Amino acid sequence: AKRVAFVTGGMGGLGAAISRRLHDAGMAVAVSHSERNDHVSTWLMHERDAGRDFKAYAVDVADFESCERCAEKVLADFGKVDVLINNAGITRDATFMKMTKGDWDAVMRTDLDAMFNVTKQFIAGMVERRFGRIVNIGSVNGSRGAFGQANYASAKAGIHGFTKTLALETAKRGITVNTVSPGYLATAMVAKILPQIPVGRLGRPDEVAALIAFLCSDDAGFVTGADLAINGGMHMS
Amino acid sequence: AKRVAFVTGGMGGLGAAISRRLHDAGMAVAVSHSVSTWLMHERDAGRDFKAYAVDVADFESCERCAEKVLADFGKVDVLINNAGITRDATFMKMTKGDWDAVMRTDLDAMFNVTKQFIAGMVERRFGRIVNIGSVNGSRGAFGQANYASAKAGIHGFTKTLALETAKRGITVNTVSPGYLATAMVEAVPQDVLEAKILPQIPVGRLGRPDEVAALIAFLCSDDAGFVTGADLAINGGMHMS
Amino acid sequence: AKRVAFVTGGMGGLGAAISRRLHDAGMAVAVSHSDHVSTWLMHERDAGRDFKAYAVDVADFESCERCAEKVLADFGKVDVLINNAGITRDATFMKMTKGDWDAVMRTDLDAMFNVTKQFIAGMVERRFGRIVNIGSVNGSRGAFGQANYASAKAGIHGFTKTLALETAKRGITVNTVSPGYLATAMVEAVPQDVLEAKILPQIPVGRLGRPDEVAALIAFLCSDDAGFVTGADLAINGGMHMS
Amino acid sequence: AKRVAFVTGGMGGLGAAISRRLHDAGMAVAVSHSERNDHVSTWLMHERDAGRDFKAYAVDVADFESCERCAEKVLADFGKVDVLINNAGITRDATFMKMTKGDWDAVMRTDLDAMFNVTKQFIAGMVERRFGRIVNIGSVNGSRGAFGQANYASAKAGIHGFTKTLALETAKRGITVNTVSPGYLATAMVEAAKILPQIPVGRLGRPDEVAALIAFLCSDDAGFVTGADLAINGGMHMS
């Protein structure tokens, strides 16, 4: 039975690279989104033109019930989910002194609470079948802290604490949970940044996708509760 | 003036120990809570604390509370974000409410409480913000995906807020305690903690809250102005990295 | 121009797993050794693999320079360098001798300098390099009876970070791979009931790691998809240590 | 029954700051050096002008026998050593391309081997007595790596490996072992552009600040801090 992967924000700069890599690894891939049908349709179509057959689901990862409804559809089509990539999130940048409580919640409830809201929908299947791969997308900015992002940095760091506890809980049931923590990436939304990066360039979404593919393969069963940093050397210990 | 400290959860096991050390260091200490008797034993003890009610999960409650505090003291120089709770459960069994109660109180507290006092610390070019983490955010812990997520997130906050206040005479650090001899933990039967707890701690004993308070009293001094964005681990050797 | 890897301690439990993966990936592999390399080479040959092997004392700069002379002559160049060679000389710090200390410092840490020095200039010139240094989970958490081993392995990561910084603009990455307890012949010699009593409880995943798994992660690190990983410590320890 | 501290490099910018802090905390303090008697006796004089009596001792921390000799003297004089501060150290900066074996060896044999060479001479005392404090001085360059310092970064990183293991082995005998990891300091050395933009607080640390921290760790309120790395780097490095 084919391995199934669910990639939240699966149509993003990094979600779409991850999805393509996981499909090319031979998995049945579902991607999550909150966009209008035309966006989703054109995306699905061009992917179909590049040899790739995706199925997409609408979700609000900040909303538990919505995750429940989303998971329902996914499980009905693929019947199980083996590989979960918590990749969906948002930024709401403000200096701390300017930050509104609204800036704060949008980022906590979405970026961090997604660890509970989404992973809750799939964890029983993984434990039942004694197999799973959960990769939580962190950020270099949860490691080093960032100016203007007290909220996004608190969420990415919290994400690692969740990675570690889940790994401890699921280790003995064939499931590994890891944080992958990318630096700045040549995405669509993305001289104060580049000199920050020893390697002297943005990382490619596909590079991060490659590392993720490895973590979800059968060769990475001894990596759990780890933070994999892939940042162009922008941050070290 | 005189140095003024606000210890959220200031009457709790660690909070109490902390409030007493900042007091004995020459600070005028306000203690937050969610009372009368504790305050009696304390003035009695030799110290004068002012208690405020607050719900650190609730911004509004925080902002109201700061108003009383400041009305009374003029300023806040030293902020100890110590208030926290656990709602433990395996992930499989953890409810939306377990998860949520912990995020709001333990991690949202960082924004809510801190938002109230940052303004004056920057104006007065001085501040000591000390966020209480946990060794359980550092290494992770069974039954506590919520707690470890919240406590780990606190250090993202520490690190960003130390970067933003760096040139303003303010330091922001996390202190991560291991297992402490608070009244809760001392209720666990001797044989149970010798079986499940003490063998985790190379030093072979619970850490006193006073010790943690002593470390924090140091970080809040002028001598520690070059310590910022650090996580100081005081866990008896339970975790190293 | 088939990519070339050099693997110090290349016939050892983990070293051997590494050489096989890198060989199966299409890389030309040279392995280093400090007795029965004949036998090791023979068993590899039986398994369908061509390795060239080289004697060296990694703790000896002049020894490493001679070894690289021969390797470079043979293979033309080294694109991938695996500093895997390592010994332990365990003792409580109170019983440990200067010999226990020196043996581990020279072989495990000085080696980082002695070896990498030989191959660095070629990588800089070609504007491509991969360098992976093997650390240890005992570098990260420290370990009873291994003040020398922990010190050496911990020190390897200081090395990796500095060389990553220095080399990042010349197409070179440098990382540390820190493995947990692995099922090597040595360790498999342990009675299953001692392994179960004392070793496996430390490991949340509940088994030793297979030297091939660690080798697989390193093979990913050495590919054209790993260019944006550098100065990194990748822990592959089955949940034994987190931070 | 006063506590005795021994600070190697006890006359350097940081070393001297530390010795002053420990003395003012009530400790008898011995200091190690490898300087000529001229320099030493004068250093001693100004300190004594300030109302501090130190005893100073020659040692080569990169040399086991030397350390053994130095330590007998200390011990004959003060009877014991309760607190050890491994502070002595050097640098031999170069790019990896340019660094020589000698550059490498001088940094490793001195900065990292000192953990063994020095601490071996005092560890037994602490254990028998069931009380000790060992503070090993690392470096922010240990944590982040530093261009030009492949040797010194390795030595300084190596030092926490040592800290964690010895914290483990001694934790039941009332001893803590910690690394204190300072960023760039105001030492007559650095008071000799590139640096400060690295430091979020926008200034050099005072050696005295580092010494305050270490004075806390050596005190009786810090017995639950062990195997830890305390960073005091102005924000220069975080997690």
Residue numbers in the entry:
A (entry chain C): 3 to 192, 202 to 248
B (entry chain D): 3 to 36, 42 to 248
C (entry chain B): 3 to 36, 40 to 248
D (entry chain A): 3 to 194, 202 to 248
Paper text:
Here we report a functional and structural genomics effort that applied saturation-level transposon mutagenesis and next generation sequencing (Tn-seq) to identify essential genes in B. thailandensis, followed by high-throughput structure determination. We used an “ortholog rescue” approach to maximize structural coverage of these gene families, which are likely to be essential not only in B. thailandensis, but also in related, but more virulent, Burkholderia species, such as B. pseudomallei. Using only seven Burkholderia species to select orthologs of essential genes, we solved structures for 49/406 essential gene families, and for 56 total Burkholderia protein targets (including seven ortholog replicates). Of these 56 targets, 25 satisfied criteria for being a potential antimicrobial drug target.
